[PDB]
Amino acid sequence: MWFGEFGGQYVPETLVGPLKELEKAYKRFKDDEEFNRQLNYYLKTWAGRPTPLYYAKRLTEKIGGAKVYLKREDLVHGGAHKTNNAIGQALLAKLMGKTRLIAETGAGQHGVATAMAGALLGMKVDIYMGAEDVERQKMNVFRMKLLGANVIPVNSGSRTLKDAINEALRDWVATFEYTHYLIGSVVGPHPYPTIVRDFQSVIGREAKAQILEAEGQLPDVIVACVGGGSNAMGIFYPFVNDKKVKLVGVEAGGKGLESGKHSASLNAGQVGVSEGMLSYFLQDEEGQIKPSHSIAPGLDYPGVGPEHAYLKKIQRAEYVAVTDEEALKAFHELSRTEGIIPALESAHAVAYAMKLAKEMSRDEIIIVNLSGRGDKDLDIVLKAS
Amino acid sequence: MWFGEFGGQYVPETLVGPLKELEKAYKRFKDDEEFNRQLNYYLKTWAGRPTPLYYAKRLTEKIGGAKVYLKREDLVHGGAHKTNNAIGQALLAKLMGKTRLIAETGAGQHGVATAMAGALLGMKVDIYMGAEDVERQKMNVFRMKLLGANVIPVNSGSRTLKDAINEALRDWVATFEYTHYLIGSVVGPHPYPTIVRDFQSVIGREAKAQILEAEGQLPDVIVACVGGGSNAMGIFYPFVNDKKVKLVGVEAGGKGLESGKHSASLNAGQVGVSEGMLSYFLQDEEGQIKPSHSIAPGLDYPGVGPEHAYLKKIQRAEYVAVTDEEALKAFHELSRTEGIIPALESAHAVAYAMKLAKEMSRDEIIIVNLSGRGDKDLDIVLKAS
């Protein structure tokens, strides 16, 4: 419920009941033998876990500083960390006796992850999507249909994510008995931020074994991009009780923090209650929540996860930002130098890691979370160049 | 050089020296401890090998016959089996003392795999693509550009694959001193058929181990799509001396075997010399090379590898055809039932495995080679729908 001062269940009473039933179910299963047999089985044979830790010999040498390892979540089925959470929640839903999954997306990336997992486990999938976002993302709409998901287009309101979240939360309230609401990131009302981190913490447990195998010591610094902060919490959480290990989140700097068009909640954001949780959001002079901007659609969220806010206060994790032009720089450089086309989201985490590598010694170690592959971001990089 | 009565080195005197150099270098490195350590290292940390063996429960249960396992080559870095051979030959070329890679691509897949391998190993990469293909494949061209390769667009002749192969031979004859020619299937003069199969046999080695751990016994049938036959030779070769393991290759049935618009060289082809090898090719009344057809670009090749001609003559493998229609259903059915979007190439193997499974016992095992993921084929299945 509470990561220090941040978190909670700040929702209407009609949602409070379901969330308690989810809370009760998650407790029963999260340590159950058969739930973890099934989950680990699918994560292995379907998703292709474990994912490798890659030493970037060329990139490390070009910089001349600390050794740069890349945790390759780009190689997971679907091409993003998002799959670990979708399988977990979709399986939990199946054992809870649910027959249907709902989710929300504008990009399409989380609906595809939700669709894939629904099809795996033989559940119905309805994905609420704004009619504006549908036109702009026709291939992810087609993917979802190919996967047997129903995309319900939302012509009510601004026809965007906001209205799709409203139409979706409306559905869950009614249908919770048989339907599960699969949340993308470590955001929203408890218990969602806890469950999503628990299903993404496989990244760090693997990274830990793999860096101790590769180098015979824990890493000096771990870098991860932060939209809502599922992948960062994934690769952070198991290294939390290792004081030596510095955790760095990279938010979207956008055009610049002084410019207004950014998504850096933990930098220039203010404490509020939105979308079920108490955390940092982006706000103007008045109390209103402002639009966010990032060239990476994944980092384009005004909010940040409550656990990341908690980690920023106690100074266990620093939180920095990277410009769109710096991210595109690192997108091109990793492609040329490692033959790995990263996600624009992961391009941010890369961009900083190269800066931090120069300043550190060749004996030292940087692990960078490569959250996904950039096949989905090829159009955006073309237009930008 | 010869697989029974098939294979050879049908090339000009100008290419005998380069190929002899390659064969001698290959003899030297193929069993070298360091080459194999370095190759296995790139395959693990960069490609994400091993790939899982996935039991398709819902598909298996829907047909009501044999267990259907998918070998998940779709999960390898780059999204196809082609990566295995691309790393292999690039690492061979580097340790030979070559500084440059040249390749022919039509569809662009082998171009991207060569470009990726190039970046990894820090070698120059010039890819020869028909200028007509460059217009059709904007993403793959941009991908190769990002990955630090030059696409050398070829404007001479038909502006197609044939003309790119010739100007890539012309290139090699001159530059072979510092250049390796990276062939992307088990075709062309010796020693290419041997080398490409050696670098793809990792697929079968992993699959033998995985099905023995999983089921405690060898598969009853192994099914792979056959264009040139590299992914097929790859999963077949380790099982050849296992007499009770049936091998089935699935060529492109196209619009139908009686239509004359297909790529089923082994079913409806004649023995003769083309592209430097004695194998089966599609021939007209004259005996000149007939154009081929498949909805899957990777199967759209009038010829087939000499080792597949050999396995057919000794009746060790059975070779069948699946139509564009049957593959399309396969593409849709797997996406909906297992949440895996296969390549149109691999959808041929899935299509035939589903037919075979219905006829067989629930206790019997089929391994299908899922050679790639269907992201690249989404435009063509949308047009078809």
Ligand SMILES: N[C@@H](Cc1c[nH]c2ccccc12)C(=O)O
């Ligand atoms: N996808 C590859 C397929 C390919 C390359 N070389 C081949 C030789 C034989 C058969 C198929 C191929 C391409 O770019 O076209």
Ligand code: NA
């Ligand atoms: Na944010």
Ligand code: NA
């Ligand atoms: Na063929």
